[PDB]
Amino acid sequence: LEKELFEMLDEDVRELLSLIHEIKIDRITGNMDKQKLGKAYFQVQKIEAELYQLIKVSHHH
Amino acid sequence: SKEVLEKELFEMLDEDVRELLSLIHEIKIDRITGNMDKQKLGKAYFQVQKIEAELYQLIKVSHH
């Protein structure tokens, strides 16, 4: 599922950029970024888990 | 000085995530290609962990 891992990684990482951008603006519109901060939190955890799986796969695992 | 500690955290995050993306892109190429240097994968692992610690700071700083 290396094909899929890479696909998800790229999609999740893009989404994270967007999310960081959205949060930057949310602060400056004086806005509730809380839910978006938390969503970002889980997003990085999910990337970490996918990169960890990528490392297992790359290792004859 | 939390407004500059925030503004720089936002900057680190953006650059670090953009880095992570390029890395995903380069690592893919390396796989299709059988490149023996796997260093971009471990740099990618390092990048998420550094993104994780930055975002955590940004959270702790964003709200008392």
Swiss-Prot record, chain A:
Q: Which domain of life is it from?
A: Viruses
Family annotation (InterPro entries): D-63_sf, Helix_hairpin_bin_sf, SSV1_D-63
What S-S linkages are listed for this chain?
Answer: none
Provide the function of this protein: This protein may be involved in virus assembly.
**Subunit and partners:** Homodimer.
Listed name of the protein: Protein D-63
Please report the organism this UniProt entry assigns to the protein: Sulfolobus spindle-shape virus 1 (SSV1)
